[PDB]
Amino acid sequence: DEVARTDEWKGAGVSRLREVWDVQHRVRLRVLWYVNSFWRSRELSYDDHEVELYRALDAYRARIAVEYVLIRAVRDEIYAVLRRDGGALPQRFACHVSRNMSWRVVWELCRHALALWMDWADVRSCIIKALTPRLSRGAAAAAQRARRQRERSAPKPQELLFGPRNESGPPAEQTWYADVVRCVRAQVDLGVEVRAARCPRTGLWIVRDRRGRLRRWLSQPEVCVLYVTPDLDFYWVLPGGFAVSSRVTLHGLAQRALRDRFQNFEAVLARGMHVEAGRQEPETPRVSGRRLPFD
Amino acid sequence: QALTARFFVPEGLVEFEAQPGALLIRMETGCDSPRHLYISLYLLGIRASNVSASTRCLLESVYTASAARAALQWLDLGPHLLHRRLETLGCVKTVSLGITSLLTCVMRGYLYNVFALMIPKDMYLTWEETRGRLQYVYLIIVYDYDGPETRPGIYVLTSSIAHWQTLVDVARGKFARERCSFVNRRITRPRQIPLCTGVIQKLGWCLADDIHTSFLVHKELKLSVVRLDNFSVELGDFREFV
Amino acid sequence: LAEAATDSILDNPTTYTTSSGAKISGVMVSTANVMQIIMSLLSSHITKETVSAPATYGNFVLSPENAVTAISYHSILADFNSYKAHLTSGQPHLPNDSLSQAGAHSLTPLSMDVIRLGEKTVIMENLRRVYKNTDTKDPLERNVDLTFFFPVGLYLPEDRGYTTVESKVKLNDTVRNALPTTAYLLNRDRAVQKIDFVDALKTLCHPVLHEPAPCLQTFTERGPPSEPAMQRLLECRFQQEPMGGAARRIPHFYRVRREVPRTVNEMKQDFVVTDFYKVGNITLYTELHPFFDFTHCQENSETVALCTPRIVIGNLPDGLAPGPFHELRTWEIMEHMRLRPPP
Amino acid sequence: METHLYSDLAFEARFADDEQLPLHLVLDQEVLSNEEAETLRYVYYRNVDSAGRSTGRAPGGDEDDAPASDDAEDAVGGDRAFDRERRTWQRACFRVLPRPLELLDYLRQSGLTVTLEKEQRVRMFYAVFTTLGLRCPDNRLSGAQTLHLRLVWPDGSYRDWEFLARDLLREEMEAN
Amino acid sequence: HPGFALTAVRTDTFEVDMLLYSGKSCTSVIINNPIVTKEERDISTTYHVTQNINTVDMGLGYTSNTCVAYVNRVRTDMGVRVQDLFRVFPMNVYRHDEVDRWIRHAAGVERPQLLDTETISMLTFGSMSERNAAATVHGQKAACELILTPVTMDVNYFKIPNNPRGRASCMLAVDPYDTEAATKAIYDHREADAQTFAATHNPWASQAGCLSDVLYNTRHRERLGYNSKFYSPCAQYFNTEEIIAANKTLFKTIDEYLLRAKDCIRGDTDTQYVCVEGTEQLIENPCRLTQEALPILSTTTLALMETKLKGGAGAFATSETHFGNYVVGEIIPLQQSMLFNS
Amino acid sequence: MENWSALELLPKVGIPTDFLTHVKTSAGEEMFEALRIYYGDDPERYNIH
Amino acid sequence: ANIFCTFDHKLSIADVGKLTKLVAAVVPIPQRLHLIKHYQLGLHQFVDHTRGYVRLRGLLRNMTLTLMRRVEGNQILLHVPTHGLLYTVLNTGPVTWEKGDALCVLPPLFHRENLLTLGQWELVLPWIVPMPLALEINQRLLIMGLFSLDRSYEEVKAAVQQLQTITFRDATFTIPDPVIDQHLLIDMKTACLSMSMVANLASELTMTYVRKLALEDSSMLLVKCQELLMRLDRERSVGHVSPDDEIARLSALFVMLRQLDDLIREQVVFTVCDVSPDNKSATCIFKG
Amino acid sequence: MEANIFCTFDHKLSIADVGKLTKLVAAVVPIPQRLHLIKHYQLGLHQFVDHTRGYVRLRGLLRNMTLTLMRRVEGNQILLHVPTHGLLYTVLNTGPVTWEKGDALCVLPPLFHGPLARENLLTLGQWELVLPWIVPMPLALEINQRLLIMGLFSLDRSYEEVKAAVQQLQTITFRDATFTIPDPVIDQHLLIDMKTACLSMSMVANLASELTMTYVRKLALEDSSMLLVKCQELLMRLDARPQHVSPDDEIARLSALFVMLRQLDDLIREQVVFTVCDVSPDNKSATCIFKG
């Protein structure tokens, strides 16, 4: 009568246990080898020549640089536009200001701020946090729809008199992400989700917390802020609400390089979520150690 | 109201069963004249894999009687086929003693104006500890496949769950050992074809405050029981689950 | 008690009156014990009477017009004939209601006990007879319950200690007498019972006390306060600087002439004991849990809620667990280890 | 345990089809913190050859090799690239043990008999038991292959690590 | 002494005799000639007889008054035993199994048990995880639902009838139906409490998210896992939802007190269990309406207890202080006179 | 949802009303379920449907 | 509770005598009217040569089954029973009964008095059978159905000959072959192909569904499922699936097992506690 | 024990409520606890329904509630009678389903009706008298099959490919009326059924004899027909004398296959509660026997 795979698997047991680290040397984890795995019966080969390791390390260099290259591209665009317009920049974010002030010190503080931001370039940043929704499948159709509907001639009268309503394209509130740098105590705020609105009185921008409260930056001389829009417009603003603006340029990368890295996840259905598309959901299952385990 | 039937049994089977309250089962064996032999849970406790050794030996001494041996010997051939060989006849209310005895059991009824159903202790278990107001009660057989041969377990259990599907859903939950042992038997030896892991029969409903624990005596020997003080009988079919 | 009850909508003025003496104002009903106590206590005011009572129930029958309106519209308007006649004639008022039109004119006499309460004459019933030998409790036998509370382990300030009973009781100098770590109660009958902290262990050891997960959850949910004094309380910055050149970098932090905000925990330590509970204690919205610290602080210039355990009991706020109390706990520890004459 | 055994079985059923061999891994309080291991929803892995090419594609490149489009009607190969990327990730099996344990004591409480060379017994606050497959281009493993570990939580956030096969197999295989 | 202090809360039931007043023809009783219904069998036949009563109230105020005139027995032990918090929250355990078992043994509790599945909780009326004691010469187990308390909570708070949570919460003072103002009154700590003007006398109970609040508010219990059969004295002070729900007008809250706010407690079991069969009588709870608790005789050392037992009747009423030893005198002269004079 | 207009038009019987507390307090504190209070003479009752 | 039935034809004294012999039989009718015509009584209305057993089994399950009563002049009374009440039923089946049996009904298969005929209409009553015999004979007929395509081989001929005969306590049978003219009827055809295809569908589907289920909470019973599936796959080798295709296959599995429910389920109708010494008739409790 | 269940209503019911509740005599209303004196707040399915949670749990709670017939509605007392097994009772249907003769009826939680009326019966406060649907067997086992198959298919599928399938699977047409399955969440209450189904399918796959496996291919060698062609297309891309023959082998293997198919079928089945007799022509009410 038959021997069972699990029984000989148990009785054979294991004898191998070692820890391995990720290439960045940031995480450790254990690998276990069972003496009844079919790995031992296979008797296949192994090769670890130096050229292959060198090529893999070059691929890793690209994988790492995918974010810092976007940082560098936006930096170079900032400087290029700063020379382009002669450095004299208009007001773009609304706040009251004085003509009798030492603007030179704020210019030097701006230099300090951009240098300090360049040092603290990181994977979490407004450019990456704005890129990530751009990669999702909906963004192509959504931006296509937004451009198409924006590209609408003024309605003929019968269109407005009859049928389903006419509508306005954008909502009154914009969704933004920003990088906040403070020089008086070297400190940079990168993972910021922020709301923005374009003022009706003047065409300038008012910026709000994700509570409805106004932000404090424009008043504080020691702070500079970077802004990116959901359509990837871009601003670098120094105290007084004066900003440098340009496109976020990303033609310096191939599609797969950034796409494989920053692909936002989409779920596959597992216990504790509704089969109807996008329906409301209960609180998470969370198999947990604080309660007596169920079967 | 109640419906009654009359039966003949010989004394050797009746001895410990002679007390008024019991549950009666019929054995069919491929013999020629004694095809059907009438046995009870008191005798079946000898082969119940879930009863303790001391009570097992107590019943072994109690049913040394000659006919009970041959009755027990017929249980040997086929553990998986046990519930096939069994058929149930309700619970007993009458007794007259003799070499050949006349006893009566009800198939569907109660006693107007005492009528209890006795259970040997290790045959009893509950999935509740605060009893519901109305308790449905069952005879269930579960098979232990993890061995050199399969051994049968016997239980009578009380539960308020009336719907069969949810009932078996929880029974599988607590009897997962027998499911896994069944599949272990299947993976081990495909030569003999095993049937279900457990068998349910529905017979009864009672009120929780009318459930008593009781002490029982026969032949100056003494065994303790759980009893359903006012038993209502509604005999169902054996139903299988894996 | 009697005068508070408002008089009825109506009355048969001839029903339930003492044959010659008085009109009955109300009836008082209570169990045999209370009624007997009253009969013994207020003996001078209690007297036996014979009163005129209605011999039979009032028989109310309905008009056929009411039957028709009932079948059609599902309603009654009692004494339909009277309403119709008064609306036809133009009379404003009706002489009596539908229920004064019942229970009438059959008086037979019965004898009761009565009590005099000024103008009021009141009947007294001891409903013993109606319930004896029966299986139901008298509905005037009631269960009432109360909620009680008492402290244990509470500690009195040493700064203002006083005695009111010095000549009555004198205690040994020991620290156990000094520090109130137990409490004593009375049983259902007057007998002494004692609660130590040991008796509390069945509750105080439960994980539910020690898990602030709902505490932190609702601390975050409520949101930070918008009041300007609280607003200056909210600001606080923490971050994890690298430790590599930590020593050599120390002077560069002080080169910057910028003062730093006190943490909430730092501010909480200057409120003296007697006013830690007052409104002027800004930090009070923080103090949710004895074992745990809560705070709002900043990261990424966002305001977040931080929770952290008070590893040692010394970390408790001074206002809630003062220093002299710690000195007394240390003296209790030394007394327990019999070191109170410290080597 | 049970996931390791089950996946070692399941990979054998599809060794010829997938050309992947099973690899059994354990995670602790140094890879992810307690609440993350308590609320973990998915685990995914993705293979990379020594040349930096994913396995959801033919070696001879793909149309995704093009530079970024920067368009708006197309985002970056909007649907095509997204679906190819969803193709290039495979899903692994996992189990969570929400209690502190000694790994050898847990395994001997289980049916196994761990026969390690000396008492380097290790303690951990919690354990999750993942298992991954790594691919055989031919019946051989390239030491410069890279294998990626991805972990996803109910809020859709994810963590991503990558390991090169040489460290896993350093002398597990060259001795074999 | 650990680094904190405790305050206990317990509910004791009294069996009482009450006297009632009612004026002549307070209400009219309407009755019908009885209806007879028949069920017949071949062995015996049974008759069911029915008669309907309709009572029409015949006054515009309150025509009847009651008062709890007399009492002689306490159904509860007046004990000081602590609630078994493990039984009410049964599923929860410590992370490390060894320390969990150590705590279970040290504090004397059984193993954790899974709660009854929703289908079972529907089919049977509660789990009742705690059994009857073998004997009890005293009455029911008046379980004290302890709440935590700073070491230096103001001693005077316990000498008069107060809310044990440390803040005023009687919804008679708040303007009716102003739920916003009522939640402000119960939870705001920049507006002082209405009873003992201050932010709070217990900062670990009186504000949302305190350990007392999550322990004893039924909402936080519902978010957790617990057994609802176990009646808890402390819940009536912390159940924000129906405290606010009672914020109605004067006469409606009087009618709710006398009709709806009554408690139901099983009379047979030692542990105070809730009851919904209706066959059991309801219980009158003045503390619910007043939303306060009563102080009871308690003392630190046997010295003061003995000197109060020594002195003449009435010494129980006073509250006394020794250097570090306090006495809390009972606010109503219950224990010494009212119970035992009978 | 009472027929207050019918109550106004229908004949009525007079009683010496005795409120425990002042009538406007009894109405304002809603000792009575269902109410209607109006001031002056409100002509709502002068039409019949 | 009564049902009346009238015969259109005449009735000789011999025919009414032949009828009264059945005064305790189990006579079913398609549905319950107060008065029914004689055609609907019995299974005769369903006896088309092209259909046979399996469909008639489900028809007998669906119909109402009644007991007979003593007869008026030209009109027979049928007594519809009630649950939990005892009645006297006559054993028309060729089996002996014992006090305590569970009884089931199935259409007749192996048949002078049966010609209770009033011209080309015959009162074919159902069989009353002890439940284990009914289950086993259902199994045996179904297995005969499976060999139907291979009758050319001599050993399977002998196997069928052995299957057909069943022996019971003092009883023997010869069960007719479900194939006529070496061809299979349509109801048996559907039943057997559906059984075979649910087997095949299980074999194909369970391998992918065990993985799809295993990702979440894989456990020992599922591992045993995997072991048996792998061995079955290897033993069958002796020598990226689209959504809608999977939907079709999964639906087909369940609809196929739904067709089998006629032969899978075996419900009880009568349980007996009495028997005549003559064994001509018994008394039973009614079920179902 | 007690054959009559008394329901007490806690409101001063007006003419409208007492009239419209009189309109529902001999309707089926579910009761949890089966006791003498019961309050209206624990009558019907109102407390057990919660849209954020699944239809599966509502069905599970419904199977265990007991059924009663409503009669003799009088002042604040509703007098529910419990039907006894094997007697003749009249019932009033709630859903738009049409009842034939001979059909067996099973109880299911109400569905989302095609034009979504719901007709707002008895909203006496925050409460509402939610009644279950009484449905004939084919539709009940059809919807159980649909829920189970939707759970089986849905796992490990992303949402976008799910949507197209479920929009086709969710809607069931039956006797010219069409209904939608409301809330098919993948609950662990459904995982238990799926696990049992998977085990049963594996077992029936394993122990089936070689002849049972080979029959349809032998039939394709034998015959050609539309049903067989559809089966062939079903098996298309997944695709002599027996090595030894024996009858008793087939008996044993087939009996095991039957017990396993019984498990798998039971996962679809629901327990019958009524068998119908000839029906009032307006579908309003039918006469039925109470089964179980």
Residue numbers in the entry:
A (entry chain G): 298 to 592
B (entry chain T): 44 to 156, 162 to 290
C (entry chain K): 246 to 588
D (entry chain G): 1 to 176
E (entry chain K): 1029 to 1370
F (entry chain H): 1 to 49
G (entry chain V): 6 to 116, 121 to 248, 258 to 306
H (entry chain U): 4 to 242, 254 to 306
Give the text the authors published on this PDB structure:
Composed of a diverse array of proteins, the tegument is an amorphous aggregate sandwiched between herpesviruses’ icosahedral capsid and outer envelope. These include in HCMV the CVSC proteins pUL77 [pUL25 in herpes simplex virus 1 (HSV-1)] and pUL48 (HSV-1 pUL36; also called large tegument protein), as well as pUL48’s non–CVSC-binding partner, pUL47 (HSV-1 pUL37; also called inner tegument protein). Analyses show that pUL77 seals the last-packaged viral genome end through electrostatic interactions, pUL77 and pUL48 harbor a head–linker–capsid-binding motif conducive to PVAT reconfiguration, and pUL47/48 dimers form 45-nm-long filaments extending from the portal vertex.
We noticed similarities between two PVAT configurations, one virion and one NIEP. Comparing subparticle reconstructions of VC1 and NC1 portal vertex, we observe analogous PVAT architecture characterized by three distinct layers of tegument protein that stack successively atop the portal complex and its integral DNA translocation channel. The 10 copies of pUL77 that cap VC1/NC1 portal complexes form a distinctly pentameric upper layer and a loosely aggregated lower layer. In contrast, the five pUL77-l subunits of the lower layer are visibly less structured, exhibiting weak density in our VC1 reconstruction and being outright smeared in NC1. We thus characterize VC1/NC1-decorated portal vertices as a fully tegumented state in which the entire complement of CVSC tegument proteins and pUL47 exhibit stable and orderly binding. While the primary means of VC1/NC1 PVAT attachment to the capsid is through CBD helices that integrate with triplex-bound pUL93, additional interactions facilitated by small capsid proteins (SCPs), which sit atop major capsid protein (MCP) capsomers, likely confer stability to the top-heavy LTL.
